[PDB]
Amino acid sequence: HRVLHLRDRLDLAAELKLLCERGPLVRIPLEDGSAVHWFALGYDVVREVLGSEKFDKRVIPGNLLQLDPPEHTRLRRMVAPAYSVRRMQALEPRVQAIVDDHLDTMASTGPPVEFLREVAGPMAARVACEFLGIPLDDRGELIRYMRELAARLRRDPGDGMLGMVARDHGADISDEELAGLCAVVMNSSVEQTESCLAAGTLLLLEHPEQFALLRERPELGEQAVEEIVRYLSVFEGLDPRTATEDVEIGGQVIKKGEAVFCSLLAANRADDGFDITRKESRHVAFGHGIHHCLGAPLARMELRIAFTTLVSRFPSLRTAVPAEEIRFRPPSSNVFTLLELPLTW
Numbered sequence: 001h002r003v004l005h006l007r008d009r010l011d012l013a014a015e016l017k018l019l020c021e022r023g024p025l026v027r028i029p030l031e032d033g034s035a036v037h038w039f040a041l042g043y044d045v046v047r048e049v050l051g052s053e054k055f056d057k058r059v060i061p062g063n064l065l066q067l068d069p070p071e072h073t074r075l076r077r078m079v080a081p082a083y084s085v086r087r088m089q090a091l092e093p094r095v096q097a098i099v100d101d102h103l104d105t106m107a108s109t110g111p112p113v114e115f116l117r118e119v120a121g122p123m124a125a126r127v128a129c130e131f132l133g134i135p136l137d138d139r140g141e142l143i144r145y146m147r148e149l150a151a152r153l154r155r156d157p158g159d160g161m162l163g164m165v166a167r168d169h170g171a172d173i174s175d176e177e178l179a180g181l182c183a184v185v186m187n188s189s190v191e192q193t194e195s196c197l198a199a200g201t202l203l204l205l206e207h208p209e210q211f212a213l214l215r216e217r218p219e220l221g222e223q224a225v226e227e228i229v230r231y232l233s234v235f236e237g238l239d240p241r242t243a244t245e246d247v248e249i250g251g252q253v254i255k256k257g258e259a260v261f262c263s264l265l266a267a268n269r270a271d272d273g274f275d276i277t278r279k280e281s282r283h284v285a286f287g288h289g290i291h292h293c294l295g296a297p298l299a300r301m302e303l304r305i306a307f308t309t310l311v312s313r314f315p316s317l318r319t320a321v322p323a324e325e326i327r328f329r330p331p332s333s334n335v336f337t338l339l340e341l342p343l344t345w
């Protein structure tokens, strides 16, 4: 369903805008008759689908996204406390210092920099290691095996999320499951986070009035992050939800066995101007329901710290090429991202 990923730079492509005019829930019978699929394109309908207990994540270790209740509930309940408010507050100054480390490197290497590979990527990966409690001597290689690392950490719990889980649920979670929890954080989550960091920096640079506003008013940081994750929608479309029974959604009956594809991109953008003064953003960039992004507290905190510090430390920041020359990854189910971001200051 490639149409759900068609963009014009950061915006929706005409072809996808045209599809969204067909309504927030679109029936898509397959040309071969093999199945009936649905596109959930609107904010309310996507929330209706994702909140419903009448869908599973069937195909048509430690990876929560591939589990349905009750097994999903069991594992999520064990890892959830690592993202409490009390955990993020204790972590914030250390995240601030990691951000500062990387903007230190940047300000000393001097311009230009390829912001994605040289700053955003390493920063996100280093924050993830800190959150997970990866031993310092393992971080270089991990960022550059998983079962071995997870088994050693399980043998002697340390700090961070992996230590909490092993300490508090040692017997209940296997080596491979603990390794899987680590991999999801270090792989997909870093991809999404680094993309937000780099493309969000571009978005701010393309709205210089708001780049400056966030420097003058750092208290806008939390609002800015919500507007940035809404506007970017780097996680564009979700794994299909298959109805386990007939269910009425947005006025239509989705029959047992039919698959629904939620487009966070369309839900976040099809209604929109980028504005960090918005006090509350209408978006589903982190999903909704039992699979709602477990990392959202961390992502929100890391991005707030990163964007606020960046605009403060680099008021002269600018793209080293015309914005219109930036390359974006072509339509794919993979995370949306630019390919490189040359900056100068």
Ligand code: HEM
Pocket (backbone or CB within 6 Å): 064, 065, 066, 076, 184, 185, 189, 190, 192, 193, 196, 229, 234, 235, 238, 239, 264, 284, 285, 286, 287, 288, 290, 291, 292, 293, 294, 295, 296, 298, 299
């Ligand atoms: C801006 C960055 C991020 C975005 C936009 C994002 C987005 C999402 C979305 C939309 C989902 C739901 C997928 C679905 O329901 O099919 C999800 C799930 C998940 N995310 Fe994130 N994510 C981000 C960063 C992170 C981080 C930093 C972590 C961990 C440190 C993380 C860990 C997870 C996990 C474990 C799940 C699965 C939860 C479950 O299935 O119960 N994500 N994310």
